[PDB]
Structure formats: structure tokens, C-alpha cells
Design a protein around this ligand. Structure first.
Ligand code: MG
Ligand code: MG
Ligand code: MG
Ligand code: MG
Ligand code: MG
Ligand code: MG
Ligand code: MG
Ligand code: MG
Ligand code: MG
Ligand code: MG
Ligand code: MG
Ligand code: MG
Ligand code: MG
Ligand code: MG
Ligand code: MG
Ligand code: MG
Lengths: 141, 104, 68, 187, 141, 227
RNA sequence: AACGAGACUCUGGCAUGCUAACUAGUUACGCGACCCCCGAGCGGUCGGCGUCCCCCAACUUCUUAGAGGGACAAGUGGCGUUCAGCCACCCGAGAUUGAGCAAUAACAGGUCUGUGAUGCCCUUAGAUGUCGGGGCUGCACGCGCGCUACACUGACUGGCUCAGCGUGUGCCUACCCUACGCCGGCAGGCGCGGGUAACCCGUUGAACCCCAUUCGUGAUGGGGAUCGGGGAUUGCAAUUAUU
């Protein structure tokens, strides 16, 4: 019997899809382990959900993540939101309801943007200035 | 016998293009032609940004014109005679209709 | 800010109430459909604004009568 | 700890804000304990949303300044990181308590407004006390390590230490004392 | 272990020694008087740069087939400072990348692909996996 | 070519063709009430349609003019002989086509008439044919050596928003006289023909309209009648 | 009563609901194969990596683009002559995205060097309607918009790892975007293919940023002006240096 669920996360034109499936541990993003994602200064940022729910909740699932878009920092947030959105969706279809609304609150109390993406996008440039709001230098005399 | 045939439509007006494509889908399905639903390719956007004034005086304003090209394709497995039968009827607007005889 | 409705919205809502007084209730998501079916509003934003002023008027007509 | 984030290594419990005014405007512990001073952080949305920000992310944000440092935040987190370890070596106290004491010792509580060179004295709001403290503490580290062989991380720790141990040898405390003296003259 | 499970900066360092431990992989003659790209200012610091770039090219071919010279020279391209005028992106050196791919073929490590390009042989995947395992077991990752 | 032009160039080239044909037929059928072309590329043929007010003048004697027009349109745009096919047609309710009125006023002024008399005549005609409003401007050296402008408005007229891309017809025409050029500008508002084609459908955005039913009776007794 | 404001159009944010896709994918296993034990184990079975190859597999989560939905100051508490409305909060993708369009009246504003728009004046064969050469770039100086810097929050040398909006073979007009092999330190050359394009360049291996070396407060390895000598390409032609 197949048992799996696919979810996604977004942050500034950078999608990250996570596939959760019954297994043992093994949170793997783009084939490489989670401990070796390029910017290791934000290492504690994509570890927060598992450092929050404990190693025991990610003990019956095998999550695989694939990312594409944005930059080196907009993808960390995509991954970190996608794996949470995945564990919360797997717990609400194959487990009880309180068992999912407990981890939902554990996650959404410490930080939003773990379950709800944020809608900030770049703004358009206008003629007469190097950017959206700045204007070129005025010159009387 | 049977042939894999491809119709492609493209136009600058969504309403009439979708109407033509839907009526084609219907008028080909009623004869059990095993149609393959419309495939919406990305919409193309030609853009031209010009100065608003002749003569170069005044505040430096600009105009942004743009044209939009919508494109769809349909795939059928049917004899070519029936394809020419159904594809040459009820083409109201300035939509294109191209037929190719082998694309699969 | 804004959120000040215009005469085109207020007059429409007043007419809608003065004709179909008995079909309108106190919730917004039903008044929306009622005004959608009885009138012809050529937009969806205008429909929501008219249906939202109709509710605010209905909440008052249950008290003392308004003067329009 | 499984439910208490420190900083990786720096525990955020047993840190005391010994002011009654400046607390509720310094977000150190018990709800704002986080692993890194780096969040998305739509904190510049409404008027007072800024006081809910962790203080280490209020310093990380302010430290990247003067042109060729704007947006370079992953460079500005490693600075605070390398500085906290220098602080823990030179003193031995929890490096967050040194930061809190430095923020307290360097925000002016009287200041003066130009009015009608006529100035009139006024008292500083707590949020402006925190903001001025952070700005003053960052400018000292900036100006101290501009053409020295010392690094921006040694001088930030020097500043924090000389500020928490009120000494007038730090740029921030010299500046506080001037603003309050100039304001006392115009009293 | 696989090649993707280990820190790549130590993997390149180990593979460079592996290559410069056999005596094979004949280097060009101009190794001491070459700038490595148009956008550089000096010759590489490391005297034995050719083995490091061969290891890098091999680990890059392990991760995408059919690479060919015109992409190796994009993989090593960076920024050029045109003195007083703004900076731009610039390509690597075709001669260097071509001689590196020809020196790797001289080791049975790579072969010309079926579609035009270069690809690892079965014998090269093995030599990369062995070094990956060696690195993983060394640092006890 | 062995592989034909791309879609972008194809559509741009179609637009340039239509613009050049419209310019050509504007410069010629002015005295015959030319009011627009409709290129309808039909199976096996390229058909062009010319709406006008005086169709006999368009085709002429046995159709000499229309055949000359087919000839030139086939010579200049490089069509294979026998492809270009041209038709004339009469426009209904000519008072609502701005170009027709603009050219009519241009020739009525080129023939000698008090400019106010001419403008008021065309205003009368345009408003009588059924139209929410009109506006006619004439700019130039009217009665003197210093230029001026004279505007004659009537009825309702909108200037702003999206509803102006429809619901209005605009025409700008130059008219050269013994001393310099005059500029004619005509604007007309189309009167919302529902399901018809004298104006547009899709009424104005700020036009909410309410219907009123009846047949509800208050006298009621709980009777259940059967069938 | 009319115009302008608003309404209106495009755009950004949300749909695990609908429509449906080898010119987009996912998962599954049919697979088959490579590789390493990296796990129990043996190395096999189970697994782990794959932009390695297939499916007339199942599907639309990610991609595409159409139709609808959805936000209304609607709910709750204060302040309001209890009216129009304002502040705060719950729920929420969101409680104040960004542009386009825009009135009456006017200016001796700019444009006769955009026009086969144009009045009058001038010239019209010793032309004010064509070819060769020079100029528009000349340098005591005054001014405007800008690029690069004044370094250690740095420069250099290696390694690693992420985009989006576009354009692409030309009718007169003759030129487009490039893969991959070879040759050359480099600019560049030769040879063979794809693309009129969600099909090929392209999974657009972008820069800053990230990780390690050398430098050490010295106008220094910061900065890159000015100038000498050499090599290529475009073109009918490069000197007053085209790049
Ligand atoms: Mg910018
Ligand atoms: Mg209006
Ligand atoms: Mg408007
Ligand atoms: Mg009134
Ligand atoms: Mg209220
Ligand atoms: Mg909420
Ligand atoms: Mg707006
Ligand atoms: Mg105006
Ligand atoms: Mg002009
Ligand atoms: Mg003139
Ligand atoms: Mg000019
Ligand atoms: Mg000539
Ligand atoms: Mg000449
Ligand atoms: Mg000049
Ligand atoms: Mg200017
Ligand atoms: Mg570098």
C-alpha cells in the first residue's frame, strides 16, 4: 500500500517541493544530506523544525526535497518551510487530528513562515530613476 | 487509414480563440475522433517602449506598447479527409489554423 | 485610507433595499447572491460593496427607521 | 534545551535586564530565544512592531553600514558570532549580559531639541534609548577599526566591554555624556 | 558511500592527491606561464594547479553528463574588472579546459559521449566513489 | 523561405499591411465616405471589404474603379494574380461613424461655409442619429492672423478610464485652405446597443440596474390543491 | 444634471477544488544498467546515488493557461449628534501592491531638422537638388548628469553553489542565436550540426554572497590615469590610437 504526500514551499521566486513517504529518517534535499547545504552560516535555519519536534517525529517518514529558483538564501527558507508543510500534511491524512494540530501549534508559535509563506515580491522599475522609488539627480542652475 | 494530425491555433484575442478551439473540440468529439485536449503554450508579449514626444523637449516620459500572442495546439488520430472536413468550418475571427500531417 | 462609499453605491443599495426588503437578511454571503440575482452589477467589486452596504443598512432597519 | 534554544552555545536564560524602563523593549529571553539573528522579519510594517525584534538581530541589522556593506548580512552574522566568543574569553561572563549592560550604559535619558542656536531640553523615550544605544555601539566599532590592524570583531567586543564596564573609554559613553551635558546646559 | 554524501571541498583536495600520486595524467609544458582566464591578473598561487582542476572537472562530470569545453569554460568563468568602467562576466580558458579533458581521457576516466560531449566511464565512477568513501571514513562524517 | 517567417514577425507584418492599406484607401475614397476596411482572409482567397456611404461612387461605371482598386492592391502588395478580391458595402447609421462626419465636415468647409454653421449642422446630424453625446473641435486661423480654437460639445461625454477604448469614436482630419491648415477633431459616444451593433454591449461600469417583479399576493389561506 | 475623483483595464499575492498537456513534469514500478558497502547482509534480497535508458504505466503536487472563487470595513470591542465614519483585535493568502487612463481654461513652452502635414518669403543650373577630402572630437578656463576609488566590513589566488525579464536567420536591406570536435597563452581561427523556437543555444553552472590561502597600516600586493612595444577581428577605408 502506497503512503506518501507531496507539498511545496515558496520564498521570493524559489520553489522547493518535498515528498514525504513512510520510511526511516533520511531527510535528503537534492540527493545530498541536510547537513551540507551550501551556506552553512544558516545551518541552524533549516534544522529548526526537526530541532523543534524532535528526532522521533521524523522516524516513520523519508522526506526528499528538490529546490529550484531564487538565490542562496531564498532557497533555505523554501526548504525549511516545505519540510514542515510536509510533515504537517502527512500527519493529517494518515494519523489522528490532534496529533497534527499539536505539531502545527508547536511550529506556528515559534515562528510563522514555517507554514504560511510571505507575499513580498520585487517591485517594478519606473522611468526617471534607477529603481522603483529612487529618481535621478535634479539640477537647477 | 488513420493519421496522427496536429492543429495549431494562434491569435491576439482570448475570447474568440477559446471559442474557436472549444467548438472545434466539440465538433470533432461528436464523431468519436478521440481528440486530445487543448495545450496552452506560454503567451508571448512583444514590448516596445518609446519616447512620448518628438523633438526631445519637456519632462522625459515614455510609452509602453505591447502585443500578446496566444497559442494552442490540438492532437487527433483520424484519417486526413475527416481532418480537412472538420478544420475548415466555423473560423470566425483572425485566428490562425495550421494543420500538420504527422507529429507523433 | 478611504472606505467611504460613493453615491453610486449608496443609491444602488437604497433602491435594492426599498424594493426587495423581505429577501435580505443579516449575513453578507447571502445578500451578495440576492443582489447578484435581482440586479445587474457589471463588476464583482461593485457587487461586493453594494452587498456590504446593504448589510450595514439592514442592521439599522431592525432598530428605529432610517430617513431615506 | 530540547525546547530551549540557546544560540548554538550561549544560554539565554539567567540574563537580567536590571532596568524597569528599558525592559519590554529588549527582547532577549523566554519567547524571543532563537538560534540565529536572521529572520525574514516584516518588522518595519507598523509603528511599534520593532520592539518585538530580538536584540541580536537589531545589532546584526545595524552593523552593516557605510556603503560597501549593504545587504551583506551573512557577513554581519559571523561578525557578531566571532565577537561573542572574544567577549566570553576576555571577561568570562555570558556574552548576552555584557550586551544588555552595554545597551543600558549608553542610551541617553535627557537630550535637546532645536527650537524657535537655541535648544530646549527634553527626555528620551525608551525605544529611542535602545535605538541610540545600538547606533552608538555600532559607530564606535566602525570608527575604531577603519585603518587599524585590528579586526571589526575585536573592536566590537572592545566597545561592548568598555561600555558594559562604564569607563568613558568607549565612543558610545563619551557621546552619551556629551548629549546629557549639552542638554543640562540648555535646561 | 556516494560522492554526494561528503563535503566537496575535501573531496577535491583528496582527488587532487590521488591524481598527483600516480605519475600518469601528463600535464602540458606551459603550466608555469599561463593566467588561467582573461579576467585574471596573476598566475595561480598553488604550483600544482592542474591536478586540482582535473579533480574539479571530474567531480563536475560526475554530476552532469555531456559537459564539453564550452561549458567547462562557463563553469570557471567569473567577473572581470575593466579598470575605470563597470565589471562584467567573463569565460574561462578554452585551451586549459580542452587540455584537462584530453588528459582525463588519457586516464580512461572519461570518454567522448554519444551525443557530442564528454562523460565519465564506469571505471571513473568507481575511482570517485572510492575517494568519497575514503574521505567519509577519514573525517568520521 | 524554406522555413517561413516566425509568428512575431508574421503578426507585425499583418498589422503593417492593414495600416498601409487603410492609409491608401483613406487618401483616395475621401470624397466617397470611406469608413474602414475589413481584411477577411478566407479559404483560397484574400478578401478585402470597404465600408462607405456612397457605394456607387466606390465601384463607379460597371465597376471600373473597383477593378482598378483590385489591380493596384494586387500590384503593390505582391499577390498572386486572382487572389485579391474586393467588395464594397454600405454602412448603416452613418451619423455614428466619426471618420465619415470628419471628412464630410472637411469637404463642407473646403467648399465655403461659415465654420459655425457647418459645425452646428454636423452636431445636429450626429445627435439626431442617436448618440449619448458628441464633441467637435476646429483649430486654426479662424477669422484673423492669430490662431484660435472653437469647440462645440453636446450631450454626455467621458474622457477617462478604460470605457473610452470603446464607447467613443475619434477622428482627426487636416483641411488646407488659402492660408494654412485647419484641424478638425470629432468625437462621438455610442449609445449602448444591447445585442446590437450600432453601439457596444457591456454597459458602463457604474450602471447598476435593478429589476422589479410582481405577482406576490398577501391574501393567503393554507390550501393544498392537487393535480 | 453633466465632467473630473471613484468605478474601469493590466499587474503581484492565494486555490492539493475544475479544465488538460511526450514542445512540461511527478511518482511508481516495468524496468534495464553503472557504481560503491555506505546498512542488516555477502557483495546477492532489502536498501543508498543518477538531468543513465525506456513505459500504448497512473496522475497534474511542482510548470503552463483558461474558467470560476475569494475581501465587503463583512465579524467582535471601543470612539462617534450613536449618521457619515475612525482606532484596536480574531479568522485569513491578504484588512493601506504597483502602474495605465484623466477635466474646464491656458502658455506667444518645444517641434517647419519625423512627415508626400502646411501658408508666406528665399534659392532654382556659376543651385541651397551628388561624388572625394576635412569637421561635428580642436583646449588657458566656467558649469550639469555620471563611472571608478580612497582599502582589512579589503585586495589576490583557488574551491563551492543559486535566477528572472528577453532576443534569435531581414522582403528593399543580406547581417541572426549558437552547441560540439580540433588548433592557439589570449583575443581569435578551422570543421561539422540544431533552431523561424516551452522543441536548439539552455537544466540559461551570472555576479555579489559562501569556504580556504598570501598580504599587514607602508600612496602598500589600495587605485588604475597617462604613456611605450607587439597580436587579432569588423569594414570599401581604423592616422586624430573604432573595438
Ligand atoms: Mg536597484
Ligand atoms: Mg467618470
Ligand atoms: Mg480613474
Ligand atoms: Mg446636486
Ligand atoms: Mg463597530
Ligand atoms: Mg492570524
Ligand atoms: Mg491602486
Ligand atoms: Mg488635467
Ligand atoms: Mg512639426
Ligand atoms: Mg514652412
Ligand atoms: Mg535633429
Ligand atoms: Mg542624394
Ligand atoms: Mg561627403
Ligand atoms: Mg556633438
Ligand atoms: Mg537629464
Ligand atoms: Mg573568487
Amino acid at each position: 500500500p502506497l503512503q506518501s504526500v507531496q507539498v511545496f514551499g515558496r520564498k521570493k521566486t524559489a520553489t522547493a517541493v518535498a515528498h514525504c513517504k513512510r520510511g526511516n529518517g533520511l531527510i535528503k534535499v537534492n540527493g545530498r544530506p541536510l547537513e551540507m547545504i551550501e551556506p552553512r552560516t544558516l545551518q541552524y535555519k533549516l534544522l529548526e523544525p526537526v530541532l523543534l519536534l524532535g528526532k522521533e517525529r521524523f522516524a516513520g517518514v523519508d522526506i526528499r526535497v528538490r529546490v529550484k529558483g531564487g538565490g542562496h538564501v531564498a532557497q533555505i527558507y523554501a526548504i525549511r518551510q516545505s519540510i514542515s508543510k510536509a510533515l504537517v500534511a502527512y500527519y493529517q491524512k494518515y494519523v489522528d487530528e490532534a496529533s497534527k494540530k499539536e505539531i502545527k501549534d508547536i511550529l506556528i508559535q515559534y515562528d510563522r513562515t514555517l507554514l504560511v509563506a510571505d507575499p513580498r515580491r520585487c517591485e517594478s522599475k519606473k522611468f526617471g530613476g534607477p529603481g522603483a522609488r529612487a529618481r535621478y539627480q535634479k539640477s537647477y542652475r | 487509414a488513420i493519421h496522427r494530425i496536429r492543429i495549431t491555433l494562434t491569435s491576439r484575442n482570448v475570447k474568440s480563440l477559446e471559442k474557436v478551439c472549444a467548438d472545434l473540440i466539440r465538433g470533432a468529439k461528436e464523431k468519436n475522433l478521440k481528440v486530445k485536449g487543448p495545450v496552452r503554450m506560454p503567451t508571448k508579449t512583444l514590448r516596445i517602449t518609446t519616447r512620448k514626444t518628438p523633438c526631445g523637449e519637456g519632462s522625459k516620459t515614455w510609452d509602453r506598447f505591447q502585443m500578446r500572442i496566444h497559442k494552442r495546439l490540438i492532437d487527433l488520430h483520424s484519417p486526413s479527409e475527416i481532418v480537412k472536413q472538420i478544420t475548415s468550418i466555423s473560423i470566425e475571427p483572425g485566428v490562425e489554423v495550421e494543420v500538420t500531417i504527422a507529429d507523433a | 485610507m478611504g472606505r467611504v462609499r460613493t453615491k453610486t453605491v449608496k443609491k444602488a443599495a437604497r433602491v435594492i433595499i426599498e424594493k426587495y426588503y423581505t429577501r435580505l437578511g443579516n449575513d453578507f454571503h447571502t445578500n451578495k447572491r440576492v443582489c447578484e440575482e435581482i440586479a445587474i452589477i457589471p463588476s464583482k467589486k461593485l457587487r461586493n460593496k453594494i452587498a456590504g452596504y446593504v448589510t450595514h443598512l439592514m442592521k439599522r432597519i431592525q432598530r428605529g427607521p432610517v430617513r431615506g | 534545551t530540547p525546547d530551549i534554544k540557546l544560540f548554538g552555545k550561549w544560554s539565554t536564560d539567567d540574563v537580567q535586564i536590571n532596568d524597569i524602563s528599558l525592559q519590554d523593549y529588549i527582547a532577549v529571553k523566554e519567547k524571543y530565544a532563537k538560534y540565529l539573528p536572521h529572520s525574514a522579519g516584516r518588522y518595519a510594517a507598523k509603528r511599534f512592531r520593532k520592539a518585538q525584534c530580538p536584540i541580536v538581530e537589531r545589532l546584526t541589522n545595524s552593523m552593516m553600514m557605510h556603503g560597501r556593506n549593504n545587504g551583506k548580512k551573512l557577513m554581519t552574522v559571523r561578525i557578531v558570532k566571532h565577537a561573542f566568543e572574544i567577549i566570553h574569553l576576555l571577561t568570562g561572563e555570558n556574552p548576552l549580559q555584557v550586551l544588555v549592560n552595554a545597551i543600558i550604559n549608553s542610551g541617553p535619558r535627557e537630550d535637546s531639541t532645536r527650537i524657535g542656536v537655541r535648544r530646549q531640553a527634553v527626555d528620551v523615550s525608551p525605544l529611542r534609548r535602545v535605538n541610540q544605544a545600538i547606533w552608538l555601539l555600532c559607530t564606535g566599532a566602525r570608527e575604531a577599526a577603519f585603518r587599524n590592524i585590528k579586526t571589526i570583531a575585536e573592536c566590537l567586543a572592545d566597545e561592548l566591554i568598555n561600555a558594559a564596564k562604564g569607563s568613558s573609554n568607549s565612543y558610545a559613553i563619551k557621546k552619551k555624556d556629551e548629549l546629557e551635558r549639552v542638554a543640562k546646559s540648555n535646561r | 558511500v556516494t560522492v554526494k554524501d561528503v563535503n566537496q571541498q575535501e573531496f577535491v583536495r583528496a582527488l587532487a592527491a590521488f591524481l598527483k600520486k600516480s605519475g600518469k595524467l601528463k600535464v602540458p609544458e606551459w603550466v608555469d606561464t599561463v593566467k588561467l582566464a582573461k579576467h585574471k591578473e596573476l598566475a595561480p598561487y598553488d604550483e600544482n594547479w592542474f591536478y586540482t582542476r582535473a579533480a574539479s572537472t571530474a567531480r563536475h562530470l560526475y554530476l552532469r553528463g555531456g559537459a564539453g569545453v564550452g561549458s567547462m569554460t562557463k563553469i570557471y568563468g567569473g567577473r572581470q574588472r575593466n579598470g575605470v568602467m563597470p565589471s562584467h562576466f567573463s569565460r574561462g580558458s578554452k585551451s586549459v579546459a580542452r587540455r584537462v579533458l584530453q588528459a582525463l581521457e588519457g586516464l580512461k576516466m572519461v570518454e567522448k559521449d554519444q551525443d557530442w560531449g564528454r562523460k565519465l566511464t564506469p571505471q571513473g565512477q568507481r575511482d570517485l566513489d572510492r575517494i568519497a568513501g575514503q574521505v567519509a571514513a577519514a573525517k568520521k562524517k | 523561405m524554406a522555413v517561413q517567417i516566425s509568428k512575431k514577425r508574421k503578426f507585425v507584418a499583418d498589422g503593417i499591411f492593414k495600416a498601409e492599406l487603410n492609409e491608401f484607401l483613406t487618401r483616395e475614397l475621401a470624397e466617397d465616405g470611406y469608413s474602414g476596411v475589413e481584411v477577411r482572409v478566407t479559404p483560397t482567397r484574400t478578401e478585402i471589404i470597404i465600408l462607405a456611404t456612397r457605394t456607387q461612387n466606390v465601384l463607379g461605371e460597371k465597376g471600373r474603379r473597383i477593378r482598378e482598386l483590385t489591380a493596384v492592391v494586387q500590384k503593390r502588395f505582391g499577390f498572386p494574380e486572382g487572389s485579391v478580391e474586393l467588395y464594397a458595402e454600405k454602412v448603416a447609421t452613418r451619423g455614428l461613424c466619426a471618420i465619415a462626419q470628419a471628412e464630410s465636415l472637411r469637404y463642407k468647409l473646403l467648399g465655403g461655409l461659415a465654420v459655425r454653421r457647418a459645425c452646428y449642422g454636423v452636431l445636429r446630424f450626429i445627435m439626431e442619429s442617436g448618440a449619448k453625446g458628441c464633441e467637435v473641435v476646429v483649430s486654426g486661423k479662424l477669422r484673423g492672423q492669430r490662431a484660435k480654437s472653437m469647440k462645440f460639445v453636446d450631450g454626455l461625454m467621458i474622457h477617462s478610464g478604460d470605457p473610452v477604448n470603446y464607447y467613443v469614436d475619434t477622428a482627426v482630419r487636416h483641411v488646407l485652405l488659402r492660408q494654412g491648415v485647419l484641424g478638425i477633431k470629432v468625437k462621438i459616444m455610442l449609445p449602448w446597443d444591447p445585442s446590437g451593433k450600432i453601439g457596444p454591449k457591456k454597459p458602463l461600469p457604474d450602471h447598476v440596474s435593478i429589476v422589479e417583479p410582481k405577482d406576490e399576493i398577501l391574501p393567503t389561506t393554507p390550501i393544498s390543491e392537487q393535480k
